[PDB]
Amino acid sequence: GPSVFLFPPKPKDTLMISRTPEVTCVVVDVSHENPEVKFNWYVDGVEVHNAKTKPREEQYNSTYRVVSVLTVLHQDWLNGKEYKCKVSNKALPAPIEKTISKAKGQPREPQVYTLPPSREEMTKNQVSLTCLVKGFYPSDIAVEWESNGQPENNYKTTPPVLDSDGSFFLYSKLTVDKSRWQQGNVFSCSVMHEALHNHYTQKSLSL
């Protein structure tokens, strides 16, 4: 029988007004003999009709993958509205329903602190620039780095770790050439989270 998986929108799509967030209802193990799948979408119980079906995709393992996409309003998602996707198909004795929404809990503003490399590190080829993002809730966040308005892609960010106070924290490490850091260059930690003023804040790091 078919299986269903309901995915939330990307953090950046919900936090940036210049983007369009969407919920994706994925149906796997759809059979070749009965691929007709009916979707019924609800938002807080009220049925909606603006969803679109993505083109069917052959998986080559004897099944299809049928997907429905529902566009959501930034404020509707951020306000904790619930999205339910009901999936009906002939091979399904009874319709399958999945529900997803933002994590419930009072949102808390992340504190962002940039931390320079250790004195002991000043002898290696490349130095590490740290950015501590703590005290945030929910865990939905986006962290990036830049210098002179240009994006720095040489970084790794730990997944959010649940702190002892019910909030989340994480660390992001950007690795650069000692020269750059030594020269006084300015590097920044860009963080996007719903609880920040304008869902944004930048923290600079240099000498």
């Binding site: 936090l15 940036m16 007004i17 210049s18 990036e144 830049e146 308005g149 994006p151 860009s190 996007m192 003023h197 304008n198 869902h199 944004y200």
Partner: peptide
């Protein structure tokens, strides 16, 4: 006021 990420509009209060 507004916030911009690499030129892109993020949000405005």
């Amino acid at each position: 006021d507004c916030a911009w990420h690499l030129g892109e509009l993020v949000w405005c209060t």
